[model samples]
Target: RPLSRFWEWGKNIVCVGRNYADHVREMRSAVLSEPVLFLKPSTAYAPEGSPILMPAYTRNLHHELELGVVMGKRCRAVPEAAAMDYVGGYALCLDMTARDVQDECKKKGLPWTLAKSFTASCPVSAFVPKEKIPDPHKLKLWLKVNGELRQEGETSSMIFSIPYIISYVSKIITLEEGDIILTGTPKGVGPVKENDEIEAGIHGLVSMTFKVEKPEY
Candidate 1:
């Protein structure tokens, strides 16, 4: 399989947080001069038709829809000006988060690995070729729970642009082929209960669906 498939070599899933101003405001977090970064374990990959198993420890599992950038080549210390040349494709991704665990992690100044690294926390859609998206920074993104709209926003609202994120992430993390960089989510994120359906997409390009399921510990 080509790198465009997302999960072939998708072992390194680097995510950005607080990249959108609206989301930052909603989360009561301040926008930062540099991007907030986190890593989701490779075990988090759940494709369409797979269930989003809510980690047994969290009650408030929130859904965050984001635009994902798939690295085309191994990137290290790449300049922001030439960042796009290394982007092979894109995907509509859900950065499923455990609000409760994350809150506790934040209160104690702990890493978010436990909250964001659980199984099936990342649900991604089919790849969108780079040629299909002329401008990743101007696209629209939205999420729906059981046919009801919850999140709707534009990539234009990102505090840090895609190239900046790519450059910053590559320099520090050394992104590899098939690794995904979640560009962050917009505002209006909320909880989804078990059996609830989640539908999210990048407007007019590609969409995905997943059902929330609670696993027995």
Candidate 2:
């Protein structure tokens, strides 16, 4: 299916944080001992062309462009050597965040669920079959705000490889078909405001556009 019309087939949206070294530096966080995992409920999936709303609870809305891995089968404790066998496809995804809220939560030692899991917080492009991408670790990802480039980075910079992430995540949580794994974003993350036109893509594979809208009162 063209990514524009693809629907999520998974039970969960698993995200990794600080996978990119520069992003960790920009966020003022140290390299994690392992992938920092977070979960976004299935309800967080926002289809292509849908408006990304600036929720009423936050003033600092940010965009983190990432590569998404879509699972093709269920597995737990899968070995890194064979992890790729379970991937069905990939997608371009946005880890939309409420920075101000996240900062507050960090200060209070709270979970990131509220800042990261609000409605329409995760915007994803259509799925690309696994064969299309022979190597997931070598693509370039970028994002733009109102036609101006904001972030551009190569996947080669990721601290952890895809197979390692899949193997690690599975040992703890059973990965089901359609479950999307958001490999972390590269550096250059910043805020987005109402009416902003956000464009992002996985170079040569898929690109998507989204408009920021004022939150519904």
Candidate 3:
């Protein structure tokens, strides 16, 4: 039960910066290095199926549709050729971000913690076993905001391949079971409003829906 629903207790959410050229081409995202790493706390997970309360900090909440690699075994110093061996499986994930806060943080020369790590900011789908999808690099990932297709792209568009990401991230930190690596989102990420319905998934395999709500406190 735990294996298939890894994000329920998944501790680390390592995210890669927009690894798609289209993101930069749109001029909304910067042209960073091949691999830009960031993180989100486990508390950020919004469960397998749930609603994400709107963060009060920013009006611009961008939905980053991504493919999350669930780690099965302890991965450290792994080679690119053998990187796929440590994968537990895959899941559709969202890097729900506060774009305005992120831009503010950038201008202030501070970290992206507040711009990103917010409560229920990440919503992941059910686990897809490593065997289900023979090649994670060719699948289709798409997302919709209020039933309108907002983001769509092929995994083949990723500037950095899954193998390179795992090997690179592992070299910096040992990844244990249940740890997830978000393989960056494709272009076309924009704001999702409160009361909006978000439906996203890996076509033909698994999917999830989310409703945005504002917190009253």
Candidate 4:
């Protein structure tokens, strides 16, 4: 499954989960023993300007907007000190989740396969090459629902910074070019209803505006 069957956005979508203290508190979960890691199949990715069809089983869908890291090449066991060297660019992404189902899996200590990695769950905008951005750590990531500010976070709040996260994740799997790592989302994660307009993006990189369509069961 190295190459995606869908349109090749050309990126591993390295994803970080529950990297914010507030989010940990909201979910009543303890700080991760280490960075919470997950993977979004490339098939699940949809570019900006694309419609996100809400799942019919939507009991409580959530919008978690974060800055996604794009890898330029393959590197394993790289040190956190040299992590940035592996980066290709950055992009803003929406990590859509099925909350109720996600909670059920958490209680049973099962994988969040269905909850986090579902059809049309990963929405991303255009890419911002690393060279173009002098300092990614100072960037601001934001999300709005129905014209109201719902979430705002910065890269400075990451439990593990970009370089550290990439190094950590790579210790296990080999990261390749065109692979994307959704570093993590900040606080204010909440339910999103159908027909609700979604405006999310990162500072100086890319911002995407779209809506969730109600799906028929």
| Among all candidates shown, the one with the greatest lDDT | 1
Which of candidates 2 and 4 reaches a greater TM-score? 2
lDDT score of residue 191 within candidate 4: 88
Model 3, global lDDT: 0.86
lDDT per residue for candidate 3 within 71-146, as digits (tens), equals 9988998999999999989989899999999999999999999888888888888889999999998899999988
Per-residue alpha-carbon lDDT of candidate 4 for residues 1-217, written as tens digits (9 for 90 to 100): 2222212656456688767555435334443467788877886687767777688876899988888777877778899998899887877888898999999999999998888888778887877878877777788888999989989987766666688788989997788877888878888889888799998877666778878886454
Clash count of each predicted structure: 0, 4, 0, 8
Return the TM-score for candidate 2, rounded to 2 decimals.
0.91
Lowest lDDT sum, 10 consecutive residues, model 2, at 1-10
lDDT of each: 0.88, 0.86, 0.86, 0.78
Ranking of candidates on TM-score, top first: 1, 3, 2, 4
Misplaced by over 4 Å in model 4 are: 1-7, 21-32, 215-217
Model 3, residue pairs in steric clash: none
Query: Where is model 2 more than 4 Å wrong at Cα?
Result: 1-8, 23-32
Cα-based TM-score, every candidate = 0.93, 0.91, 0.92, 0.88
Q: Give the lowest summed-lDDT range of ten residues in model 4.
A: 1-10
Clashes of 2: 4
